[PDB]
Amino acid sequence: SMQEEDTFRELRIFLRNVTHRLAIDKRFRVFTKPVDPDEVPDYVTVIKQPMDLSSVISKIDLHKYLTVKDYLRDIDLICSNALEYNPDRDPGDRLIRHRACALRDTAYAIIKEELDEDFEQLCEEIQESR
């Protein structure tokens, strides 16, 4: 319905806002774009489902997220990808892992403070009805 479409439009507005706030954080710069095809040639062979904040934005705009839970799976993916691909004790790896965890934690904290639980429940019920 028109009302359901307004729901989803509101969802997308909320998700763009959260995603923008993550993307402008200097700590998260490395997650803002996909990893360069040639310049890290082994990435796409270790990491089967690359994800980054620009790809999140495109997915929002393509109406791929019908719930916050679905968005958060992609935030979780950005994180798990970073922990998987940079697993070493070396400071380079430890910095990106820290930053990945901080991205995840920040997104969850923003959502905990600002997402109405009844709004999410609605989204989930509309999705489950399709």
Ligand X SMILES: Cc1cn([C@H]2CC[C@@H](CO)O2)c(=O)[nH]c1=O
Which residue, 10, 18, 26, is CA-closest to 113?
18
DSSP string, 95-117: HHHHHHHHHHHHHHHHHHHHS-H
Please enumerate in sequence order all residues whose Cβ is within 8 A of that of 27, keeping only pairs 6 or more positions apart, or say none: 99, 102, 103
Interacting span for ligand X (CB under 6 A) from 60-68, 78-86, 102-110, 113-121: 78-86
Q: How far is the CB of 98 from ligand X (least distance, A)?
A: 12
Q: How many residues bind ligand X (CB under 6 A)?
A: 7
* Residue 35 makes contact with ligand X by CB under 6 A: yes
Asked if residue 96 binds ligand X (CB under 6 A), the reply is yes
Report 39-58 residues binding ligand X (CB under 6 A). Answer: 40
